[PDB]
DNA sequence: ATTCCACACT
DNA sequence: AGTGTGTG
């Protein structure tokens, strides 16, 4: 009763960016803009293979992953945008930077964690008490919230288009706020809204880019709650939602458990849906995923997460890797070294500039290798000093650290994956 | 022949 | 450390 904590203590948005590389291609290129679109890295394998596709494109079945000849199959007028090339490989810089213009626009709202080059969460509740505070007990109009969806809403007793149905679940939604009460958790997520209305406002005005977002109490509701209306909306997931919501939804779309872990609660335990999850005790929860994983488990599906906004709007490694796939595996020492060379080159370049912008360096050196025939993704990591931002130097130093698994001028067996990562940063 | 960050476990 | 999972 009383005691039972319901985990509506925190405002906590998701924003991420709709179509994120195609719309940086479309603003560059307005002959890409309101067409069938995809974004391709390489082009002699089947044409590139595919890693974002604009919403025109999706209505054709293209998707990520697919190689562009066979997208074009399903859609004979795609267009396509390749991602530039340097040393050999795909280069995301462009992309990098625009993330940066997206992150910055959003850190003046609040403090973010950046989560992936096209999202960050945002911890809401300080602004959302503040706007609370200058509201004075003022009622919150529709017209401040003009692409949000209510989740759930409307229900009960234009109907038969998107936005009518769009309003009539947001009019439900605010007629039945309680405007005074300023510790309501379902007004503080409205308020929270409110303000995400202005920060993706800002994102576009400012870049171009479109994006949507999800408003919850916690970073997993928040996350889900943002694909429920993409691309271009924002959706409210309130507390009350939660059980209607996952009483249908695959456990597998809550975020870290999309993999093994999710699929052995599928198995374990004979269910389908998140909801189903409330029935078992957090022991036995427990005693089939873990301490950890069963106290999770065990909040998540009554829709409570503590996982904090971490204060981190910066990547905490530099990376970056090349496959050598099937009969382009690198079988000589010299291969070896040449690629290991390009790939300590583009890492030379993104630290020295990380450097200057970040005011910190890299201390460690990560070389990570598969060999062929390996199921594994990575076949073995070795680590060394990373003591100056030099790619011969640090090329040499992978070489040295990962020569003696070769088993043969030769090389054997052919490698194909090579990864050089800078981690461990110190201020600077 | 899909390609190119963060964190748990031991 | 080094391995592995999950993510986007
Ligand atoms: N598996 C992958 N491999 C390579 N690049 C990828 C990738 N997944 C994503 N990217 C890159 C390319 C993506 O543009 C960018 C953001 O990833 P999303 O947010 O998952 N997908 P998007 O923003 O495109 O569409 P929407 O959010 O509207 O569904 O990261
Ligand atoms: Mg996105
Ligand atoms: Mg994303």
Same mark, same amino acid.
């Given at each position: 009763?009383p005691?039972m904590?319901?985990?509506?203590?925190?405002?906590?948005?998701?924003?991420?960016?709709?179509?994120?590389?195609?719309?940086?291609?479309?603003?560059?290129?307005?002959?890409?803009?309101?067409?069938?679109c995809?974004?391709?890295?390489?082009?002699?394998?089947?044409?590139?293979?595919?890693?974002?596709?604009?919403?025109?494109?999706?209505?054709?079945?293209?998707?990520?992953?697919?190689?562009?000849?066979?997208?074009?199959?399903?859609?004979?007028?795609?267009?396509?945008?390749?991602?530039?090339?340097?040393?050999?490989?795909?280069?995301?810089?462009?992309?990098?930077?625009?993330s940066?213009?997206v992150?910055?626009?959003?850190?003046?709202?609040?403090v973010?964690?950046?989560?992936?080059?096209?999202?960050?969460?945002?911890?809401?509740?300080?602004?959302?008490?503040?706007?609370?505070?200058?509201?004075?007990?003022?009622?919150?109009?529709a017209?401040?919230?003009?692409?949000?969806?209510?989740?759930?809403?409307?229900?009960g007793?234009?109907?038969?288009?998107?936005?009518?149905?769009?309003?009539?679940?947001?009019?439900?939604?605010?007629?039945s706020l309680?405007?005074?009460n300023?510790?309501?958790?379902?007004?503080?997520l409205?308020?929270?809204?409110?303000?995400?209305?202005?920060?993706?406002?800002?994102?576009?005005?400012?870049?171009?880019?479109?994006?949507?977002?999800?408003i919850?109490?916690?970073?997993?509701?928040?996350?889900?709650?943002?694909?429920?209306?993409?691309?271009?909306?924002?959706?409210?997931?309130?507390?009350?939602?939660?059980?209607?919501?996952?009483?249908?939804?695959?456990?597998?779309?809550?975020?870290?458990?999309?993999?093994?872990?999710?699929?052995?609660?599928?198995?374990?335990?004979?269910?389908?849906?998140?909801?189903?999850?409330?029935?078992?005790?957090?022991?036995?929860?427990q005693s089939?995923? #873990?301490? *950890?994983?069963? +106290?999770? $488990?065990?909040?998540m %599906?009554?829709?409570?997460?503590? @996982?904090?906004v =971490?204060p981190?709007?910066?990547?905490?490694?530099?990376?970056?890797?090349?496959?050598?796939?099937?009969?382009?595996?690198?079988?000589?020492?010299?291969?070896?070294?040449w690629?290991?060379?390009?790939?300590a080159?583009?890492?030379?370049?993104?630290?020295?500039?990380?450097?200057?912008?970040?005011?910190?360096?890299?201390?460690?050196?990560?070389?990570?290798?598969?060999?062929? #025939?390996? *199921?594994?993704? +990575?076949? $073995?990591?070795?680590? %060394?000093?990373?003591?100056?931002? @030099?790619?011969? =130097?640090?090329?040499?130093?992978?070489?040295?650290?990962?020569?003696?698994?070769?088993?043969?001028?030769?090389?054997?067996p052919?490698?194909?994956?090579?990864?050089?990562?800078?981690?461990?940063?110190?201020?600077?």
């Open positions: 009763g005691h904590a319901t985990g509506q203590d925190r405002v906590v948005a998701l924003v991420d960016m709709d179509c994120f590389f195609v719309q940086v291609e479309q603003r560059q290129n307005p002959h890409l803009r309101n067409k069938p995809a974004v391709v890295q390489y082009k002699s394998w089947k044409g590139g293979g595919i890693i974002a596709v604009s919403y025109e494109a999706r209505a054709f079945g293209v998707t990520r992953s697919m190689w562009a000849d066979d997208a074009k199959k399903l859609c004979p007028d795609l267009l396509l945008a390749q991602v530039r090339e340097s040393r050999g490989k795909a280069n995301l810089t462009k992309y990098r930077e625009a940066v213009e992150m910055e626009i959003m850190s003046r709202f609040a973010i964690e950046r989560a992936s080059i096209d999202e960050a969460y945002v911890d809401l509740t300080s602004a959302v008490q503040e706007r609370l505070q200058k509201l004075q007990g003022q009622p919150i109009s017209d401040l919230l003009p692409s949000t969806y209510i989740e759930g809403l409307p229900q007793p234009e109907t038969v288009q998107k936005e009518g149905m769009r309003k009539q679940g947001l009019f439900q939604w605010l007629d309680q405007i005074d300023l510790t309501s958790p379902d007004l503080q409205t308020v929270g809204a409110v303000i995400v209305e202005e920060m993706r406002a800002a994102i576009e005005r400012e870049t171009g880019f479109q994006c949507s977002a999800g919850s109490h916690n970073k997993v509701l928040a996350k889900l709650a943002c694909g429920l209306n993409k691309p271009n909306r924002q959706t409210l997931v309130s507390h009350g939602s939660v059980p209607q919501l996952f009483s249908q939804m695959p456990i597998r779309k809550i975020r870290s458990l999309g993999g093994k872990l999710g699929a052995s609660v599928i198995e374990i335990l004979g269910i389908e849906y998140m909801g189903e999850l409330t029935q078992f005790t957090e022991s036995q929860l089939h995923f #873990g301490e *950890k994983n069963g +106290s999770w $488990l065990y909040a %599906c009554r829709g409570i997460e503590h @996982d904090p =971490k981190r709007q910066l990547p905490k490694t530099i990376g970056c890797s090349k496959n050598f796939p099937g009969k382009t595996a690198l079988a000589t020492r010299e291969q070896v070294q690629w290991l060379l390009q790939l080159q583009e890492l030379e370049e993104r630290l020295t500039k990380d450097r200057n912008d970040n005011d910190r360096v890299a201390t460690q050196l990560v070389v990570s290798i598969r060999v062929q #025939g390996d *199921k594994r993704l +990575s076949s $073995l990591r070795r680590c %060394c000093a990373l003591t100056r931002y @030099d790619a011969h =130097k640090m090329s040499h130093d992978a070489f040295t650290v990962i020569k003696n698994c070769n088993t043969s001028t030769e090389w054997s052919p490698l194909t994956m090579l990864f050089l990562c800078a981690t461990k940063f110190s201020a600077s």
